[model samples]
Target: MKLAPYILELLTSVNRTNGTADLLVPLLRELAKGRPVSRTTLAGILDWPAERVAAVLEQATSTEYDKDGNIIGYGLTLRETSYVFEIDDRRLYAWCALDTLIFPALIGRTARVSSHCAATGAPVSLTVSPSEIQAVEPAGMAVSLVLPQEAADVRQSFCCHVHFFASVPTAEDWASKHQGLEGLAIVSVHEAFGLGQEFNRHLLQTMS
Candidate 1:
């Protein structure tokens, strides 16, 4: 699969040093627990002063929060994406279908994902263990996206534009109606997971 160069850059930009990714992991774990977390709370968890917590958060990339200072994004899971994740009866949103697939490994927990096919709006669901995916519906589904060439443009466009469909034909059909999506290609979710796994490997390697 020919991933947009910007997509690879986006994956690489995930901080794995200076304790940025370390801070984010536990922050995301708190989100997975089904409640919004505040900066003060994270300060307590990390045993850092609230001022230090604010400073680290300021330096973090791809982290967004609500007006109330609740964490809404960390890494790839934004509040606006189509993928919904449920763990321990707690519901959460993901930045893309791939994020739903990768979160199990990232967070060291099983996840149940629910999403819809972009072409048909048909429902899809999967059980993701820490090591593999299972119970995929539509059996032959894939995700597609057209990313901007510039790295900065990727973060703005990639997550917002990704789509899921039952097959390549349906994915193409969906993309045809949208301008600027001609460059996108469809790949099976499993294939997408492989790409994400590679990214995760890089992240861990850099951290180590």
Candidate 2:
């Protein structure tokens, strides 16, 4: 994928702001070429003044070095990692996008869930007597749903629910049926069907 100018700018800002200012140029150049260069490569690419790169390296948390010494990947160290919930035998429905990320888990008879924004740091947690799983896509974003269980495990008997909430009129239009909701809105029948089909496909793929 071609890296957008804005994304490059964001990376440059992030690195420079954290004291790795020298990496901005080489990192952006290599990334623009579709090359999978690493952190050390980035450090060398810039060839910045003495100890500047080293200082930046020291600040990086999860830095993976390659055997060839030509590449070094930056990632979250154990100290900065967070738990990604994946239940082996349970029915789980989750989706993520550039705008908003939503995950609805149906474990046996109840629904426990959480949501967060990929662009921001706010998170919302929720649970219902019965679980509903759904996915919605607005403009300019791709939605991905994942079901970790085997396809055979999901059947018609399995109950699913979808809860949707947005900030404006469209969100209200979608949840009009379940109006006066305390915090969350309702799901439209059309959206429910879409969510069901999406979940089914995910299940079938798991079986395959």
Candidate 3:
């Protein structure tokens, strides 16, 4: 059977288990407001014991925290990165190019997203909604993708490589020079957003 290239395979390889999504959906929704979430609040919402939540967090890895030990960043984060994601007049950051696409849908909000091309300093921007991408600057912006592997560290192996490019040509230019990335491909940002939606369907639907 043919599988969706952007679906379960890559997510599983990167350790995005169903349990991770269960925590992540609420965690992401809370983080969207630009506030750090305490373990107590997250635990209360999930109706799970704090220890179980901590266990999942330990397994997931890359959980960012505030000075008060609250969660400050997950996929959609408050920490600064190359990608800028804004919602309801508050600015936030994303883990990677793909995060900028799928996060709006998961949290049920539209976002103003801006990022620079990985290969060039040219700017790229878009308005992404839960239902669709409203607009894309430079018209043909693309996102870089790396195929699935059992990445020991999700951020290092996956997030770092996926990035925005101003256009297909520029994305292709960047992809060619990167050695040993046979899995790398430059896909349109719109396509990338749909891939994110697939993840939402598989994992986040459990929330409802």
Q: What is the TM-score of each candidate against the true structure?
A: 0.83, 0.27, 0.90
Instruction: Compose the digit string of candidate 3's lDDT tens values, residues 10-111.
Output: 456444554676788788889999888887888998998998888888776678998888889887889899999999989999989888888888789999
Q: 1 or 2, which is superior by TM-score? A: 1
In model 1, where do residues sit more than 4 Å from their true spots?
2-7, 16-18, 60-62, 75-81, 178-183
Model 2 clash pairs?
39-72, 132-161
Determine which window of 10 residues in candidate 3 has minimal summed lDDT: 1-10
Question: Each candidate's lDDT (Cα)?
Answer: 0.71, 0.32, 0.81
Per-residue alpha-carbon lDDT of candidate 1 for residues 1-208, written as tens digits (9 for 90 to 100) = 7654534665645553466755766677777887777888888888888888778878775687877877767743436557888888777888777777667777788988888998888988878777777888878778875555545435456576776687767877777778665356667878776766766666556543
Model 2 C-alpha lDDT per residue in residues 63-182, reported as the tens digit of each score: 444465322333211111121222233223332221011122112233333343222333433332223433322312112221213232221111121223232344444445544432
lDDT, candidate 2, at 73: 37
Q: Which ranking of candidates, highest lDDT first?
A: 3, 1, 2
Structure candidate 3, residue pairs in collision: none
* Model 2 lowest lDDT segment of ten: 75-84
1 or 2, greater by lDDT: 1
Candidate 3 Cα errors over 4 Å, as ranges: 1-3, 13-18, 152-154, 205-208
* Descending-TM-score candidate ranking: 3, 1, 2
Best candidate according to TM-score: 3
